[PDB]
């Protein structure tokens, strides 16, 4: 409706600024901040991740889960099985569930994985890392490739069925059978993460958040999002596939803003975008992806 004005304004407030890499610098050491500091002691309780029960659940002890808003678990397994997951909920443009930012699976916590996205009704889950990423081992593996034996977590046996290789990620097909109950997930695996460098990122990253969104249209089951700490290359992509709802849904509000998009979310999961690049990515996507709605409003114009 007022969409294109809404939109052009933000076009040429870009196209008419300096932007330099300096202002991203001070832009996001204060998103950080004020993001983290001026609370009060008791401001954003994680009692329940710092249960010494489940201290050994966490990758990183300084990256825990809000009570609040942490996915809490209530499928039963064995009798050792918390509710326990170091994982948040992220809120959609149609849903308070759109999205599951959570860190990549420890050994002790595989199980836990699967127990939440059978639990949640999860149909897409992606990883933002190759398992094995410039030196270090982002997280253990929870799938498996095909022809390869089915893995077993618990009362969980999940194998691939198919995996299909794209330009800058793949894409399996898992199938995981539960209680003689049998379902298909399909977990995007991003490969190709630039290494110093956001203008060649852009578009494939698009690509990736497009290719996802032909599966899962809205928000009506959560989609799983993660690498290794459910933070950092988690949060571009909750937060560039969020303002790409907002377009397509022609809701975009007036004065958006990329700093306050990721407080908001911050608030909701720890620590979401963690470097100055992944935050020029998350703006950079978005103006992109600004200037790609405003040639769909052209078109479409009668």
Same mark, same amino acid.
């Given at each position: 409706?007022?969409?294109? #004005?809404?939109?052009?304004?933000?076009? /040429? &407030?870009?196209? !008419?600024?300096?932007?330099?890499?300096?202002?991203?610098?001070?832009?996001?050491?204060?998103?950080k901040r004020q993001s983290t500091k001026y609370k009060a002691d008791k401001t954003?309780?994680?009692?329940?991740?710092?249960?010494?029960?489940?201290?050994?659940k966490n990758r990183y002890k300084d990256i825990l889960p809000y009570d609040?808003?942490?996915? #809490?678990?209530?499928?039963?397994?064995? /009798? &050792?099985?918390? !509710?326990?997951?170091n994982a948040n909920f992220i809120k959609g443009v149609y849903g308070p569930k759109a999205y599951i930012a959570t860190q990549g699976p420890l050994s002790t916590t595989l199980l836990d994985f699967w127990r939440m996205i059978w639990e949640?009704?999860?149909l897409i889950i992606v990883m933002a890392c190759m398992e094995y990423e410039m030196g270090?081992?982002?997280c253990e593996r929870y799938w498996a490739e095909p022809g390869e034996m089915q893995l077993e977590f618990g009362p969980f046996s999940v194998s691939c069925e198919a995996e299909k290789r794209k330009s800058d990620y793949i894409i399996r097909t898992l199938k995981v059978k539960f209680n003689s109950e049998t379902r298909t997930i399909y977990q995007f695996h991003y490969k190709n993460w630039p290494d110093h460098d956001v203008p060649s990122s852009i578009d494939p990253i698009l690509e990736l958040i497009w290719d996802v969104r032909c599966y899962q249209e809205d928000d009506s089951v959560p989609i799983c999002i993660h690498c290794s700490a459910g933070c950092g290359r988690?949060?571009?992509?909750?937060?560039?596939?969020?303002?790409?709802?907002?377009?397509?849904?022609?809701?975009?509000?007036?004065?958006?803003?990329?700093?306050?998009?990721?407080?908001?979310?911050?608030?909701?999961?720890p620590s979401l975008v963690q470097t100055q690049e992944q935050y020029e990515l998350v703006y950079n996507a978005v103006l992109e992806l600004f200037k790609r709605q405003m040639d769909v409003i052209r078109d479409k114009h009668s």
């Amino acid at each position: 409706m007022d969409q294109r #004005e809404i939109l052009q304004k933000f076009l /040429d &407030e870009a196209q !008419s600024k300096k932007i330099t890499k300096e202002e991203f610098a001070n832009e996001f050491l204060k998103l950080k901040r004020q993001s983290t500091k001026y609370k009060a002691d008791k401001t954003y309780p994680t009692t329940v991740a710092e249960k010494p029960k489940n201290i050994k659940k966490n990758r990183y002890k300084d990256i825990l889960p809000y009570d609040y808003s942490r996915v #809490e678990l209530s499928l039963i397994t064995s /009798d &050792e099985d918390s !509710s326990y997951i170091n994982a948040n909920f992220i809120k959609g443009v149609y849903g308070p569930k759109a999205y599951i930012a959570t860190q990549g699976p420890l050994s002790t916590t595989l199980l836990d994985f699967w127990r939440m996205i059978w639990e949640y009704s999860v149909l897409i889950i992606v990883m933002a890392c190759m398992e094995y990423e410039m030196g270090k081992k982002k997280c253990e593996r929870y799938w498996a490739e095909p022809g390869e034996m089915q893995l077993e977590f618990g009362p969980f046996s999940v194998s691939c069925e198919a995996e299909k290789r794209k330009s800058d990620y793949i894409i399996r097909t898992l199938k995981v059978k539960f209680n003689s109950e049998t379902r298909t997930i399909y977990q995007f695996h991003y490969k190709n993460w630039p290494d110093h460098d956001v203008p060649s990122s852009i578009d494939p990253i698009l690509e990736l958040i497009w290719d996802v969104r032909c599966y899962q249209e809205d928000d009506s089951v959560p989609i799983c999002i993660h690498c290794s700490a459910g933070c950092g290359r988690t949060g571009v992509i909750c937060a560039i596939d969020y303002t790409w709802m907002l377009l397509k849904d022609g809701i975009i509000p007036e004065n958006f803003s990329v700093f306050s998009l990721i407080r908001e979310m911050r608030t909701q999961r720890p620590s979401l975008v963690q470097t100055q690049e992944q935050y020029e990515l998350v703006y950079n996507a978005v103006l992109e992806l600004f200037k790609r709605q405003m040639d769909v409003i052209r078109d479409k114009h009668s």
